[PDB]
Write a protein that binds this ligand. Structure first.
Ligand code: NA
Ligand code: NA
Lengths: 293, 293
């Protein structure tokens, strides 16, 4: 049987504040830490990525749950998905407000309904039906997010894991893009676009311009290139160069193949990431390693 | 310049009488004739797929626009998408309500917004700004579907090649009978509902929505075409894999950039048609080409 791994990442932000580099890396490393503490315990590939994105949703620095950006009405609208690479089970939600963890709501769609995708008003009904609390949105909205929005009229988070049984998964959540149209939906909740997980290949999650990612099927494509024997890195660079030259898009990828191989590559300015593997945290090409206490 | 081709299909409903069948037959002819017509004025594949689709929507015998099946709460909530092979531009809607023509709203999302995908309330506000007529919730409701919901409680598409080498797909549905509210199928998940890329081809899928999502069929079929399977063999394997991995039946239509087109299926039925060379094609097996009337 195999050694687990978790990779996580978020959408790159271009140039940022020193204490923000600092707080983002801390939020990344906590997400990895949380994910691998589920794997080190015998948790599944799914529980690891569910737990790891919940971390990123709950942390106000990240555009996902609390910290999600405001739409063109100044309201939080949120998408997410998660997928079981064993059998292709998956769950997704689009256009949701007033809940803390859509990644958690996306898990219940997969497991508790004979469906993969709920949206908007309908997603709230299952939310309420499932004892998912209701919050005032003002606790997702930051003042910073109010600010950014005003100035507009003048990224995502994700996780992949391979668990002790060789099972893989991905999870992804986002508040989208500042000033998006009411009910705009991007890559996250669309399987193969934002993510895809498969025990015959591997697991990808993606960040960057949602429209560019969905038009190219950026995660499934990534998994297509490994399906013809490219290495996880040759694949990743092949798919991101295609989104760049074909639809002018940029972004990042984290992949772990069915053998434990992995990489973090982005065609954008930067991309926040950390990974966890063989008791070591990998951070980041300034990738640097430490022990997992 | 290319001999233009348009193909239409609807999902099967298993064996049906003749009284239903000829209706279903006429419908495939009309939408395929609308689409052929448009390509005869040398119009675009994006134009043609749209029109074929609009026609099935208006035809109450098909499960899209007027005469969509019902969700669990007694009502119609519709899904649609459109894609252009030229530069992969897309537009899609999901769980849109009380309008006649979901597919046109998809193309409006394509052409007049920065995004590619809007849902529920944002799709509704958007369409209202386009002056899409909000139409009565019960003109969209037919009485045969009332029974289908009442019994139970106790997709269509087109692909096209124009005379300038472009490909395109569109699709439309009311979903699955008795679906949870807000349930989003494959029809608006680019890569699953359909795919169009001028460099490879265009595809449309009917069948079990969630499975089609899971195996990402539309893009799946095209992977093989790229790798060099014929269109017939691409459907056999794309659809092969859907049956083996997720145990879902369905079927597809597909057109190559080389103008070779096929319709193939694993379900019991897939009423389809194709119009190329001043001819109509159809067949449960024994294919029947009649000159175009
Ligand atoms: Na957050
Ligand atoms: Na109809």
């Amino acid at each position: 049987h195999m050694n687990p791994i978790v990779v996580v990442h978020g959408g790159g932000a271009g140039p940022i504040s020193k204490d923000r580099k600092e707080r983002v890396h801390q939020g990344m490393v906590r997400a990895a830490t949380v994910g691998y503490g589920i794997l080190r315990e015998g948790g599944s590939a799914v529980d690891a990525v569910e737990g790891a994105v919940v971390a990123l949703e709950d942390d106000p620095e990240f555009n996902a749950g609390c910290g999600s950006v405001l739409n063109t009405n100044g309201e939080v609208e949120m998408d997410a998905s998660i997928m079981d690479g064993k059998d292709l089970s998956a769950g997704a939600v689009s256009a949701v407000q007033c809940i803390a963890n859509p990644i958690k709501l996306a898990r219940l769609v997969m497991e508790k309904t004979p469906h993969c995708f709920l949206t908007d008003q309908g997603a709230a009904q299952f939310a309420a039906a499932m004892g998912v609390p209701e919050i005032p949105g003002e606790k997702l909205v930051t003042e910073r997010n109010k600010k950014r929005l005003e100035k507009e009229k003048h990224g995502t988070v994700g996780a992949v894991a391979l668990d002790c049984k060789g099972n893989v998964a991905y999870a992804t959540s986002t508040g989208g893009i500042v000033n998006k149209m009411v009910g705009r939906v991007g890559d996250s909740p669309c399987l193969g676009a934002g993510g895809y997980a498969d025990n015959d290949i591997g697991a990808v999650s993606t960040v960057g311009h949602g429209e560019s990612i969905l038009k190219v099927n950026l995660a499934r494509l990534t998994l297509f290139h490994i399906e013809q024997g490219k290495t996880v890195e040759e694949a990743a660079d092949l798919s991101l160069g295609y989104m760049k030259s074909r639809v002018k898009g940029l972004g990042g990828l984290i992949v772990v193949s069915k053998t434990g191989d992995w990489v973090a590559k982005w065609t954008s300015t930067s991309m926040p990431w950390a990974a966890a593997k063989d008791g070591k945290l990998h951070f980041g090409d300034d990738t640097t390693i430490t022990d997992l206490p």
